Amino acid sequence: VVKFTDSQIQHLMEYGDNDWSEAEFEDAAARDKEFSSQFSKLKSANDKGLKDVIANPRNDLTDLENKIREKLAARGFIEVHTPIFVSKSALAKMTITEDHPLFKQVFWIDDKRALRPMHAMNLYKVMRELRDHTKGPVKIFEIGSCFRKESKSSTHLEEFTMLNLVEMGPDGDPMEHLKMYIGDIMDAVGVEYTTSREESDVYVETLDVEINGTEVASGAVGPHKLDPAHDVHEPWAGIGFGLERLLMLKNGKSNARKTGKSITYLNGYKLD
Amino acid sequence: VVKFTDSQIQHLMEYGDNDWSEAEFEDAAARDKEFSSQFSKLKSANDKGLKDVIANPRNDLTDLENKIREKLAARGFIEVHTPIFVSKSALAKMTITEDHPLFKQVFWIDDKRALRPMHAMNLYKVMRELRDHTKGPVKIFEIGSCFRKESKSSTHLEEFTMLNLVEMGPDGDPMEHLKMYIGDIMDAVGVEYTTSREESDVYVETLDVEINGTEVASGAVGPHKLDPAHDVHEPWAGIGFGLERLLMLKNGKSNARKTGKSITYLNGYKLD
């Protein structure tokens, strides 16, 4: 009728990924006996995991990116690296001004610049100017950090790695093209997935993708209301994936902070 | 007698990397003509390269990073991805206070966090805590962007991709280990280089790296002076390279803004 306290679960959740939610005990002394035994059990397995990294070096995040890069490369996508700084006017083009709920989540650098909370601003600009240099499909994507202000015990990261791809002039059907790129992304992760195409009024069609019943991304297809503000006048398709959450699901990790850019974790193992 | 306008020089440096500094003409009529013809020629050459990226997608920055990654991995290095936010305490351990000349160019987020202007802060903590998990050599490196406030003359970038490697607990001669790693990076970019080794102290030895008599990097081997502030008490080696300036020298670009993270350049070609 008693189990772990609120701060000894926190140590077990830092060195291990298993759910100690309902592991009951006889008394307050029996709960302390297994905590110390399990706390050292995870601590030493966490130690041997990093010893394996030192013997067989690798970076889980880089390895995943390079597989996504080479799958999208077979489809004819150009990888671009856009700046992290974005303008106040670019954010205003995406309806993101003071009345928008995402406005208070924005890290401002000066009165005119901020850290990008998404890739749409820079990809809208790049994909349109590429249209000036070709009459065929524009296929670009980017992998890099975006930033948002968050609650401090919230599960969401303040800096997270986003993968956003977009095709601006599909030679085939734009929705079928996006579904095929989804499958390319999922095979790089190694998981199977569920897709559910659903209607919407502000896009032409929406594609909700989910892994094990958990929605992880939603793609758009067709002309959007914000297109004329970016001088875009053709049907397009695109979707964004959070890469830390994908690693967390593939590796059964406790939370997204264990797989992202961090000074306390490395390939999922704790450093201190 | 007469030579190019300053406005004409800027136009030709935005579409080409050729030096039109010392070309002279008869008078204004002949100067205004070669400009219009060179400008039109550079544009279609710039256009022809963008069409080649569309026909054969690539990204010179990713292509170089991965080549560096796989050469360092053969040496037993571990790629780590650390956060971009850093505390003002972590900077203070690096003597980056109001006293320091780097303080003025620091991008602050709030009063206790800033955007990293170098990789030393985060690499200090990851290399030290990995000592708690092995007795042999500690080898890590990061490829990521750091931020510094620059003036509007702006021939240094505000966001630049830094490559910083660290070898701790040498396992051999640390200086020749560093000499070798430099050759690995230089073979990845594909340039002939020279070295210059001077004696900082009885403890540390510095090594300067120049490409075409232009210094591109500075490294130190031994017990660094800021080690006690990070609980580090053993010799190590490290050096950082600007990935943009390296790409600028190999491809002969006119300035590093054509090779970095940009919305106007894509593999060195202008988009607008």
Numbering used by the authors:
A (entry chain B), B (entry chain A): 2 to 273
The authors write:
Site-specific incorporation of non-canonical amino acids into proteins in response to specified (e.g., UAG) codons has been achieved by pairs of an engineered aminoacyl-tRNA synthetase (aaRS) and tRNA, including the pairs of pyrrolysyl-tRNA synthetase (PylRS) and tRNAPyl (CUA). The PylSc-type PylRS from the methanogenic archaeon ISO4-G1 (ISO4-G1 PylRS) is highly similar to MaPylRS with 64% sequence identity, while ISO4-G1 PylRS and MaPylRS both share around 38% sequence identity with M. mazei PylRSc. The genome of the methanogenic archaeon ISO4-G1 encodes an ISO4-G1 PylRS protein consisting of 273 amino acids, which is quite similar to MaPylRS. The following residues Asn60-Asp273 constitute the catalytic domain, with the characteristic topology of the class-II aaRSs: an extended six-strand, anti-parallel β-sheet (β3, β4, β5, β6, β7, β8) surrounded by α-helices.
The crystallization of the ISO4-G1 PylRS protein was successful when using PEG3350 as the precipitant, and the crystal structure of the ISO4-G1 PylRS apo form has been determined at 2.78-Å resolution. The asymmetric unit contains ten molecules of PylRS (five PylRS dimers, A/B, C/G, D/F, E/H, J/I). In the ISO4-G1 PylRS structure, the residues from Met1 to Pro58 contain two α-helices (α1 and α2). The structures of the ordering loop (residues Ile97-Gln106) and the motif-2 loop (residues Lys150-Glu159) are quite similar in the ten PylRS molecules, while the β5-β6 hairpin (residues Thr195-Ile212) adopts open and closed conformations. Tyr204, at the tip of the β5-β6 hairpin in ISO4-G1 PylRS molecules A, C, E, F, and J, is located far from the amino acid binding pocket (the open conformation), while in ISO4-G1 PylRS molecules B, D, G, H, and I, Tyr204 is located inside the amino acid binding pocket (the closed conformation). Interestingly, the ISO4-G1 PylRS structure revealed that the His225 residue (corresponding to His227 in MaPylRS) undergoes drastic conformational changes in accordance with the location of the Tyr204 residue (corresponding to Tyr206 in MaPylRS) in the β5-β6 hairpin. On the one hand, when Tyr204 is far from the amino acid binding pocket (the open conformation), a π–π stacking interaction is observed between the imidazole ring of His225 and the indole ring of Trp237. On the other hand, when Tyr204 is located inside the amino acid binding pocket (the closed conformation), the imidazole ring of His225 shifts and is stabilized by a π–π stacking interaction with the aromatic ring of Tyr204. In ISO4-G1 PylRS, the Met128 side-chain protrudes into the amino acid binding pocket, which would reduce the pocket size as compared with that of MmPylRSc. Based on the crystal structure of ISO4-G1 PylRS, the β5–β6 hairpin may exist in a dynamic open-closed equilibrium, and the location and conformational change of the His225 residue appear to be important for the catalytic activity.
